[PDB]
Design a protein around this ligand. Sequence first.
Ligand SMILES: [Zn+2]
Ligand SMILES: [Zn+2]
Ligand SMILES: [Zn+2]
Ligand SMILES: [Zn+2]
Lengths: 138, 140
Amino acid sequence: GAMDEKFIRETIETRIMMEVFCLENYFDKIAGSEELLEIKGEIDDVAAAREIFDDSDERLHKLFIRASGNELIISLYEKIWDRIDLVRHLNERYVVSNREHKELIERIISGDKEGAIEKLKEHLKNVEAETIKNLYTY
Amino acid sequence: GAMDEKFIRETIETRIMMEVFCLENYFDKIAGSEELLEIKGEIDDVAASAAREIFDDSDERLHKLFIRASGNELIISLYEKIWDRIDLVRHLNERYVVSNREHKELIERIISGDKEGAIEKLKEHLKNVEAETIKNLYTY
Ligand SMILES: [Zn+2]
Ligand SMILES: [Zn+2]
Ligand SMILES: [Zn+2]
Ligand SMILES: [Zn+2]
C-alpha cells in the first residue's frame, strides 16, 4: 500500500496503544528510572532542539516500553520501530515536540500520573495532526 | 527462552494491551457487528456443559473480532504475528466451560451497551485464564 494518511494514522494509533499502556502500568518504574533523568538532562541542556531531538526522542518513547520488562511488548515495538522512525521523519517538529517531551517528563517525575498519560496522548495526537496537515506541503 | 510463567504472563499482558484498547476504542462497531451475534449464537446453541466443540472456534473468533473492529491493519497484523503464541498459551490449560461462561457474559455486556462493564469483564476473563494457567503449570 501507499505511504498515506491511513498509514500515518495507523502508526500513531499503534504507538498510543502500546506506549500509553506501558506508561500507565509501569508509571512508578518509569518515574524512578535513571534513564528518565538522563533524558531530561539532555533536553534541559540546550535552549534550537534539532540535535537534542532524535536521541532524546527515541530514548524517551522506548523507555516507556522497556519499563514494562515484557519482552514480547518490547519485541513488537522494535518490530514496528523502522515504521515509527519513518513517520517521525515525515515532518520536522523538533522545537515543539521537544517542549511536549519536557512537559511530559515533568508530569512524570512530579507524580502526576493522570496528567502524564494525558500529555503522552496529546503529544502523539499533536504529532499525528501536524504530520497529516503537512502531507502535501513537500 | 523457556515456556515458563514469564512467557505466559507476557502473552496475557500483551493481549490485555491490544484487545482492551480495541474494545474500548471501537466499542460501538463491535456491539453492532453481525459477527458478534453469530458468535453468541454459536455459544448459546449448546449447553453450558458442552463447551469443548464450542470453544476453540468461538474463542478465536471473539478475541480476533475485537482486534479486527479497529480496522487498523498494523494492529491486526501484530495480533496475527503473535497468534501462534496466544494459541499455545490457551492450549496449556483446558478451561472450556468456565471460559465459555465468561465469553457469554462479556458478549451480553457488549450488546446491552455496558461499555465500562465489558472492559472490566474482558480484563477479568484474561486475568482469570492467566491465573489458572499458572496454577496448573506443574500439574501435568
Ligand atoms: Zn534522522
Ligand atoms: Zn515524542
Ligand atoms: Zn485445540
Ligand atoms: Zn477468551
